[PDB]
Amino acid sequence: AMSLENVAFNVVNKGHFDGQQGEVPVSIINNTVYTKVDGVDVELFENKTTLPVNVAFELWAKRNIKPVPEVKILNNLGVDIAANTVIWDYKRDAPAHISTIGVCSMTDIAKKPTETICAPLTVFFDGRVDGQVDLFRNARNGVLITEGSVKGLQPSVGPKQASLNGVTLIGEAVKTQFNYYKKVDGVVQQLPETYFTQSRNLQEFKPRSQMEIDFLELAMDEFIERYKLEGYAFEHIVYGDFSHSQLGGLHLLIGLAKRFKESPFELEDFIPMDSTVKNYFITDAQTGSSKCVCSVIDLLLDDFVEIIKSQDLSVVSKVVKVTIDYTEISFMLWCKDGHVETFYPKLQ
Amino acid sequence: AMSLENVAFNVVNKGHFDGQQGEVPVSIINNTVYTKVDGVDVELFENKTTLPVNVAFELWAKRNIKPVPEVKILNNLGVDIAANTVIWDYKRDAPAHISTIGVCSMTDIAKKPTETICAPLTVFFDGRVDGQVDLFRNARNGVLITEGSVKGLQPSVGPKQASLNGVTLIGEAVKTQFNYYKKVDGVVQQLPETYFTQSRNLQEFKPRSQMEIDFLELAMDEFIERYKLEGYAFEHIVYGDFSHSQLGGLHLLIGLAKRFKESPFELEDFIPMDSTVKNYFITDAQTGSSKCVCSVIDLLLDDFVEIIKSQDLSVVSKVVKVTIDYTEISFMLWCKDGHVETFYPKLQ
Amino acid sequence: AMSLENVAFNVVNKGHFDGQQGEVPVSIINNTVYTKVDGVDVELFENKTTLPVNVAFELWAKRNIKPVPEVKILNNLGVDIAANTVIWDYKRDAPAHISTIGVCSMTDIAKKPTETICAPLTVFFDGRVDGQVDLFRNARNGVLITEGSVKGLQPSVGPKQASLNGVTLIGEAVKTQFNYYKKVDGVVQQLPETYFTQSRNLQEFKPRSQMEIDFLELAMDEFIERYKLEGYAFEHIVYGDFSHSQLGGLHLLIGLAKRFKESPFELEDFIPMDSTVKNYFITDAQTGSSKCVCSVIDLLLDDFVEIIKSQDLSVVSKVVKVTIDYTEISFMLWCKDGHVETFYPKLQ
Amino acid sequence: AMSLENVAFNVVNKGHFDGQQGEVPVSIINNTVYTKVDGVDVELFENKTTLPVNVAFELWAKRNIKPVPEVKILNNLGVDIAANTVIWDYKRDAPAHISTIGVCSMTDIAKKPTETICAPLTVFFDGRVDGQVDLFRNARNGVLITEGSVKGLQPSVGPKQASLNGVTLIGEAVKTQFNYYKKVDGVVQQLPETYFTQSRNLQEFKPRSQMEIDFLELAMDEFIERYKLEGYAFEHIVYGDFSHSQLGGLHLLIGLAKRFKESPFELEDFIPMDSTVKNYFITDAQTGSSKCVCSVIDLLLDDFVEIIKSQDLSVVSKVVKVTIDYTEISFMLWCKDGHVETFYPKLQ
Amino acid sequence: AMSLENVAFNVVNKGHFDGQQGEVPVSIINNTVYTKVDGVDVELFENKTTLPVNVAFELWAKRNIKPVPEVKILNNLGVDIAANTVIWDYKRDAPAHISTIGVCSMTDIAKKPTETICAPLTVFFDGRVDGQVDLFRNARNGVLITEGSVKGLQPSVGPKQASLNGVTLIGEAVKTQFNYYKKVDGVVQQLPETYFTQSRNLQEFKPRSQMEIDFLELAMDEFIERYKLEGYAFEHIVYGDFSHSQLGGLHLLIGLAKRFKESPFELEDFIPMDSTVKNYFITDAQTGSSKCVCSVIDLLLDDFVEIIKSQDLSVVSKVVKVTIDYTEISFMLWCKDGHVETFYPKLQ
Ligand SMILES: COC(=O)c1ccc(S(N)(=O)=O)cc1
Ligand SMILES: COC(=O)c1ccc(S(N)(=O)=O)cc1
Ligand SMILES: COC(=O)c1ccc(S(N)(=O)=O)cc1
Ligand SMILES: COC(=O)c1ccc(S(N)(=O)=O)cc1
Ligand SMILES: COC(=O)c1ccc(S(N)(=O)=O)cc1
């Protein structure tokens, strides 16, 4: 018995949809769902999606509340749809996928992922759910996560962090590092070697290596000396050049995090979505240096050093391709006289 | 288990709410309710009310589908709320009453009319429903309709016509003439002797007596002669003066009906509600004669003749009270030398 | 270069999208598209769909303006999507199909119907367009219409009438009768022998045979006698029983047409979509007889007589399957002593 | 003290804004204005404009309720704004002009037309209002209407008809024929000799000369003979060619009127504004003949005959300029061997 | 080729409008512009303006991204419109001006500021744009900013700070201090001597003089002693009196900034716009002292001291006028026995 008033009952009483029975009074005004509590209306949900308000309300209530892969990982692996769950995209306040399987009548294309309409779609399977590993084994196209080994399949070790109710974290009381498996046209793929973005914040950035601790703590000249980074243009790429009207470089999050301590700056997230490479229209408050499209990536500084130290520095400009978050990220590498000039996620 | 999807199920399968088990998928976008039928969205209801879209949808679905009093009658009798039903105002596309009793969890102020919140409210009771004559006896305030005699209760014979799903009709396969009863502060009230308006249209007006057949068919001069109406100014009051820029008189619907068969005219229904006296901004298409506030009433011409001839014609101006549709309707009577000049519903 | 302003340019200058170069200024406010004409805003389109306003505007502008099958036909044949055109559902003021193929970047699931996403979908092909007969041959699922013979393909002769810009007509200056073909899972399907509904209105109903001319003109008794219909209960089924509170029978449009010339009645089209069998909440204005779910179908009276006379009249009740508009329509047949009691489209 | 509640008071009590003291309670929800009447909300106004709901409500309430020029006339004369009144465009349900002068605090660009902001704008002046003839004399740009002679000002006799509360009529109890005057850059302009469109409808078309009575009554052959119209192609231009898939000709309203009495047809008014030449997407219900852009004009048939016979028939194609409603209307004239092939308003 | 989809292309790919060619899919739901990225809708822009959503979207995309004068300066100088740019009002999330010149078709009153409609309007000219100084020379009314001297015109030196993408800053890598020039009716004006507001924040307030450093660092008694401010009522005016139910004084931002460190308070910005004098409904959290209209100005404390020390302290109350941000700010000065009682931006 699926209904608007029962979904709202579950939200009010269980904090999300929990399969409980019961009903509460609901009123819907424009894009907002209210419920009556002692004669006054209380807001339960504001639709920020392009779906009908009652549809989005139900999908949000039925969101996965376990640690799930970040949306960028699912997108990079080509996931089209989830099996009997909703991956909620907290960066868009919207479902991560258009349709559902066995979740909501208005958005379901099927009740079970074994139905034929699901066969060409890359379905996300959660090994922590009973029988979903076996469903993946029979699936034509799909992506599977597990916490342990799967007999007969070589795993791909994913990122340490996952998303729990919109909080990206490395789990201490829960497991957030999953084994990844992917199947195309019934064939189990080898997932490529990949770096992983670290998914940290500008405001509350925490280092995850001794080099990152040293980058935040030491001065620019001292750090570049200690780790022998002369000629790699970290002054431009990581620390940022604020001397001209266009902001120079500043493509690594830890470089923004170090600057954000001393003086703040404005980042306009003009494509607000989860993606491996993020683009911002940045304005430095202290100097007035700005840049319309500033690509930023949060790589472990050790990984970024390894990437840039593993490149031929002998051509003026060329495309450098790096597998990050299971997708191919193109970089532009500019060199002169054997040293790095700039190195940025390519704007294409 | 009341729910949006169950209400929509009943509408789709039974034409209205019928207490049936079932659910269909529903999407709400702005003020409209849709349901999925074979892949595409079909409109079930457009909210024209000031209530939330899903609330109004339920009240419309639970509308009374038996012949019920016209809203102007219930208004004139001071009805505030209905006992366990919804009187739908088809002229406003909205519930006739703000609140409900045992109908909808969002608008209910009580489950049963015996709850003390209902005592100071005039509750409409339907004697055709089991136990509601008794509920009227026990109610502090109320209006009761019955199809027959209630022992000890002095009846008031209501109008011949009632409203069935927005259609105003004199019932043949159903009864539409009711006994009316009213209680104020626990005390049954004597309802006044009254005329009743005829509730006809301008498009499909039909006479209901020999005098009305005469009016529509005879010219103005021979009708006034046949029914001895000289000095009563039907030339102004009923037939209408279109010679000057301000339209003169034209306050009986039958007069508008006669003119409409010859030349059309525009009626700006600037307060579009059911009421005994209706006001329109009228523009005559043929002559350009117009009037901003032209009050119109549909009395049987026999009745109107009986009212205007009952009058003392020896004062210049006076207010004339007439009981119509159980409410007191003030007229203005202007006379000169023992003949009527004008006689119109007094604009308040 | 597809754009909102270009679509509006085509609407303003060519009456619809015509692939022309140009732009006009457009303002969007709520669900309405306006364009500036000499200083003031003029309404071009009001979105009655569940799609975004600018998306629906484009699909409406790109609607098929040739005679096309009525939506109920395409629905009965299981059509999910159209090949490189938009079938506009004028009864819903919305696209007949959720998605498009090579029409609009926001609704397109493919550019050409050969893309594998289109294979499991029944694609509508128009043989009047170059290359689409071939695209039908190569499609896994599809429905094809042609104006003439396709070599080797066994045709099904469609209805005489088609829809031209929302007008249902039998073409004289254009052809509206098509050959129909259907494919399921790569295999051409034999379309069943079928009757076709006549797609007429209650306002402007016109007979299409001597028997229908007889029905509209003769009284009930002499028509039943002339066409030997005693014991088949046209008194109930076709003419309608208005004596009781529940309206009896009245399931043929021609029967509603006869009654409408005498007294009007209200038809609540509570599922306003094109379908072979239509359901209405009907209220008879003259008598007050009414019915919540009154199924109505517009069969040529000759056909309906041929169907009801084909029936075994020796069982109390049984389901009677009739193929109409290519779909199987279940009727309920109630008999007594070798005469028909009632025969109506079975409410599901 | 201008206010929303005062404007609503005037609408409720006087049918429009009448400068009266008073207030009634108002609720605004989405684009609709409601007022409380005996416990329930009644709709006073639905905003169909691109202005805020309360702003449009005030402008509609302050609309001119005297006979005023039709919007196409004011448009053709280049009017941008009205002096101390609102010309309501009933065909757009919106103000005819973006801004106001001394009408509404939200739309006012000035309190009086003498303010210098009004100088470069063509201001409409109503000589029936005290002092506005003088304001026209002092205005840099303007259009003036009067009911009589203005000393020294050479008049232009306007059309017989005007608009009274959305009703277009030739006044009998009021005057609707005005003298027209126009000023550009402080200099009075000579208005051109012009025909006037008749502003009739397709539903209620009525002839206005013996020739038009002949057209509606006679068959095509005897009318063409009686009025010596052989070789002028009224068979195409006025009567309409419905034999081919593209509808041929049919550019005079009287021709559409004749056809409509026989078989109906659909007119898609895809630019729904008042204009001298109207464009429609037309579909003939009988034949299926259709045309995407069918320009229609309502000239008195006498005038149209006088125009087409004035023409040199010795060129293959040429643009023909005719002054109608004070604006220059380009026609296309196609001839062959001294006879007319087609003559239509040139699509721009 | 100006279009919605191309504006969105520029936003997605260049962070703002950059004249690039290309199109992306766009959907518009209520007041929000979305674009499709890999099958999911991503929000690009939420309309907070009173313009149509697609119009505001285009103007925001075309905003000036160079350091521009703060909106209060432009308003105080009477700027009506900008020449070939959009000044975006980040405090209102709306365009700073109603109309545009050569920016957007829906809002343009002209393509070039030399057109006659621009002559009476005070047009903003940016000397950093080629040929705009010369356009100012020929402009009837206008305001010009430059970074260097203009031959033949005496400059007015503006504030040190300007707005870069909504960030008010004193430019270090860009120039934010402009020369100001103004012309009324073709005559170059002398701009008056003026103080400038400092445009600082409550949260991150930074001193700009040794006296301001001392005010933040020293105690009240110590500071008033060091700078000999006895009798000027800085205890009331600048430090604030929180001992009574009405908050006393507190009209200088640096006084709020000092208090906000120790204990916070609520400021309601009930007219949220850029203005030289700001009014707040303030509630002190620590004490509960509050004031409905508390005018606040951010003057350099040295400038505020100079202003108050340059006044006659001998009358009970009088209006003190000070030129700030090129506009005349009225102050109320209250004195008793030769010392200051209060001194506040006059609430009028
Ligand atoms: C300043 O921009 C960021 O705060 C940011 C955060 C995370 C990432 S990430 N994990 O996609 O590389 C990229 C950028
Ligand atoms: C033009 O005015 C009417 O159409 C009208 C109809 C009915 C009534 S009524 N039933 O209140 O008397 C009053 C006025
Ligand atoms: C009152 O009901 C109708 O007006 C109606 C019209 C047409 C059809 S149809 N073309 O499906 O048979 C069915 C019903
Ligand atoms: C079908 O087209 C019309 O109904 C129509 C009416 C009036 C005019 S008009 N007054 O501009 O000449 C033009 C066209
Ligand atoms: C508490 O109020 C403020 O934060 C504030 C900031 C700036 C200005 S200012 N530059 O207009 O004078 C005025 C007030």
From Swiss-Prot, chains A, B, C, D, E:
Catalytic reaction list: uridylyl-uridylyl-ribonucleotide-RNA = a 3'-end uridylyl-2',3'-cyclophospho-uridine-RNA + a 5'-end dephospho-ribonucleoside-RNA
Localisation: Host cytoplasm, Host perinuclear region
Domain Nsp15 N-terminal oligomerization: residue ranges: 3-63
Marked site: Uracil recognition site: S295
Residues engaged in binding uracil: K291, C292, V293, C294, S295, T342, F343, Y344, P345, K346
Active site (record annotation): H236, H251, K291
Cofactor(s) this protein cannot do without: Mn(2+)
Residue ranges of every copy of the AV-Nsp11N/CoV-Nsp15M domain listed in the record: 64-189
Documented effect of changing T114I: In strain: Omicron/BA.2, Omicron/BA.2.12.1, Omicron/BA.2.75, Omicron/BA.4, Omicron/BA.5, Omicron/BQ.1.1, Omicron/XBB.1.5, Omicron/EG.5.1
Site (described: Transition state stabilizer): K291
Subunit structure: Homohexamer.
The name this protein goes by in its record: Uridylate-specific endoribonuclease nsp15
Organism: Severe acute respiratory syndrome coronavirus 2 (2019-nCoV)
